[PDB]
Every structure is written in structure tokens, then in C-alpha cells.
Amino acid sequence: HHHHHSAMKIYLYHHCPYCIKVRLVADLSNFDYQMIILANDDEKAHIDRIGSKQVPFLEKDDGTFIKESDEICKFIAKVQNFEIAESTIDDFVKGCITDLEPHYRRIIYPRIPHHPRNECDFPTQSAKEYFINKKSQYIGDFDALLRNPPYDSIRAINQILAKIDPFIKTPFINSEKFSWDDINIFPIFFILTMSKDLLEIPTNITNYIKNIEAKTNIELY
Ligand SMILES: [Cl-]
Numbered sequence: 089h090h091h092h093h094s095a096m097k098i099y100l101y102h103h104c105p106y107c108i109k110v111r112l113v114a115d116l117s118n119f120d121y122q123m124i125i126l127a128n129d130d131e132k133a134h135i136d137r138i139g140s141k142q143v144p145f146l147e148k149d150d151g152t153f154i155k156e157s158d159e160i161c162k163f164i165a166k167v168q169n170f171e172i173a174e175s176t177i178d179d180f181v182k183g184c185i186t187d188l189e190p191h192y193r194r195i196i197y198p199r200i201p202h203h204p205r206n207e208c209d210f211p212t213q214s215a216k217e218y219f220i221n222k223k224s225q226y227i228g229d230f231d232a233l234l235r236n237p238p239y240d241s242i243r244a245i246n247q248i249l250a251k252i253d254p255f256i257k258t259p260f261i262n263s264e265k266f267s268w269d270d271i272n273i274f275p276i277f278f279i280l281t282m283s284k285d286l287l288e289i290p291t292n293i294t295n296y297i298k299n300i301e302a303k304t305n306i307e308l309y
Contacts, residue, residue, distance in 0.1 A: 090118055090119070090120045090168070091118065091120055092118050093114065093115040093116070093117075093118050093119070093304065093305055094305065095120050095121070095122065095149065096119075096120065096121050096122065096146060096147060096148060096149060097121065097122045097124050097146070097147040098110060098111075098114065098121045098122070098123055098124065098144060098145075098146050098147075098160075099124045099126055099133070099134070099137070099143055099144060099145050099146075099147070100123065100124070100125065100126070100143045100144040101125065101126065101128065101143055101206075101209045102125060102205070102206055102208050102209050103200050103203075103206045103209050103279065103282075104143055104144070105275030105276065105278060105279055106143070106144060106157040106275070107143055107144040107157070108274065108275035108278050108279075108306065109144075109157040109158075109160075109161060109271050109272070109275055110144045110146070110157055110160045110161060110164070111123075111304065111305070111306055112270065112271060112274060112275075112300070112304060112306065113160075113161045113164045113165060113170070113172070113271065114164055115303070115304035115305050115306065116170070116266060116303060116304060117164055117165065117168035117170035118168065119164045119167065119168050121146075125208045125209060126143065127209070127210070127211055127212065127215045128201070128209055128210055128215040128216075128218050128219045129212070129214050129215045129217075129218035129219075130215075137153060138153050138155055140155075142155065144157055144160060145160070146160045146163065146164075161271060171265075171266075172266060172267060172268055172271070173262070173265040173266065173267035173268070174267065174268060175267060175268045175269050175272070176262050176267065176269065177255060177261065177262055177269045177273070178255055180251075180255075181252050181255045181273075184248045184251055184252050185252070185272075185273060185276055187244075187248055188245060188248055188276060190241070191241035191242075191244045191245045191248075192241075192245065192276075192279065192280065193226070193227055194227075194228070194233055194237070194238050194241045195237055195238070195241050195242060195245060195283050195286065195287070196279050196280060196282050196283050197223065197227050198227065198230040198233040198234050199234065199282050199283060200219065200223075200282070201215070201216040201219040201220060201230075202216065202234075203282055203309065205307070205309055237283075237286055242286055242287065245280070245287055246287060246288040249280075249287070249288065249289060249290055249293060250288075250290055252293070253290035253291065253292045253293055254292070256292040256293050256296050257292070257296070258292075258295050258296055258299050259299050259303075260296075260299075261273055261274065261296060270300075274296075274297065274300055277289075277293055277296070277297045278297065278306065278308065278309075281297070281308045281309040282309045284309065
């Protein structure tokens with residue numbers, strides 16, 4: 089009835105962490121799906137289907153759609169009869185993950201449209217310029233940030249990851265059971281590898297994301 093992850097359509101971007109949430113559950117549960125990567129400036133492909141420019145969204149066999157990544161994950165888990173453990177990781181780690189946001193806006197986000205692995209998300213110059221024009225509101229100037237990565241944000245990310253690392257386990261983030269902590273935290277580690285040349289990704293986090301990469305079709309940057 090289903091195949092190993094290596095029929096229903098899932099519309100997404102490669103770089104989007106909310107889409108990573110869906111691919112994580114889909115690949116680990118061997119959910120049979122067809123990955124549809126939408127160009128960043130292809131507004132009509134989003135709006136014609138779900139009426140808004142957002143990803144991810146899943147198309148069922150009956151032609152109806154599910155948006156919201158959390159709801160797509162629960163649907164896939166139901167279809168596959170695949171258990172997802174509840175969140176158990178310490179609130180300290182959740183707070184540290186939240187503190188990464190102002191820094192990865194400056195360190196990682198400007199690299200999104202230009203990274204060679206994101207060419208599927210940005211197959212044209214207009215898709216790249218679309219993203220830059222659309223995201224420069226709350227990010228800033230992409231050229232200035234790319235030429236001068238703020239080292240205070242580099243230090244802040246390194247320090248936060250150092251504080252998080254003792255709590256990170258294998259095979260999954262809370263050891264044996266795949267959980268909602270994997271769903272909510274791994275996408276943050278995933279996008280961090282876009283700037284691995286600038287950042288210090290510690291041992292436990294490195295082993296954890298390498299295991300997720302091995303068990304899925306998600307490739308780290
Ligand atoms: Cl979106």
C-alpha cells in the first residue's frame with residue numbers, strides 16, 4: 089500500500105523550515121507523497137489552490153487541501169499509523185531556540201535565495217529578487233549582511249548552541265522516540281547549516297542532524 093521513502097502531492101520549498109517539518113514526518117513514516125517544489129515568485133500556483141501564498145500545503149486524493157504544518161504532520165501520522173511522542177525536552181532548550189531568531193535572521197536568511205542547494209526554490213533571477221524584495225522589510229539589506237556577517241550574532245548563535253548541545257540526543261532529539269521536539273527543533277538546526285562555514289555547530293547537534301539526514305531524504309547544506 090505504501091513504499092519506503094527513498095501519490096499525494098505536497099507543495100513546499102526546500103529551504104522553508106515549516107516544510108521541513110512535513111518532510112521529516114513524511115520520510116520517517118514512509119508516507120507515499122510527490123514533492124512539488126514551487127518557485128518563490130510563482131504566486132498563482134499557491135493562490136489558485138489554497139487562496140494564499142504560503143507553504144507547505146498537502147493535496148489529498150479527493151482534491152482537498154491541508155495547510156498548517158502541524159495539521160499536515162498529524163494527518164500523515166494518522167494515515168501511516170505512525171506515533172509521534174509528546175514534547176519532553178527541557179524548557180531551557182525551548183527558550184534558547186527562541187533566542188536564535190534575531191541572529192539567524194541576520195546570519196542565515198540573507199543566504200537563502202543565493203545558496204546553490206536552493207536553486208529548486210529559486211530557478212530564476214526573478215524568484216531570487218522576489219524573495220529579496222519581499223523579505224528585506226524585517227531582515228535588512230541582503231548585500232550588506234552578506235558582505236558583513238555580524239560577528240556578534242555569530243558569537244550569540246555559537247554560545248546558544250553550546251548551551252543546547254548537552255540536551256541533544258540520538259537517534260532522535262530525546263533519544264529513542266521520535267517526538268514533536270524533533271518536529272519543532274530539527275528545522276532550526278537544518279537552516280543553520282546554510283551558514284555552517286561561519287558557525288560552530290557542536291558535537292551532539294552535528295550527530296543528531298546527520299542521523300536525521302541519513303534516515304530521510306532531507307539533505308543538509
Ligand atoms: Cl510560506
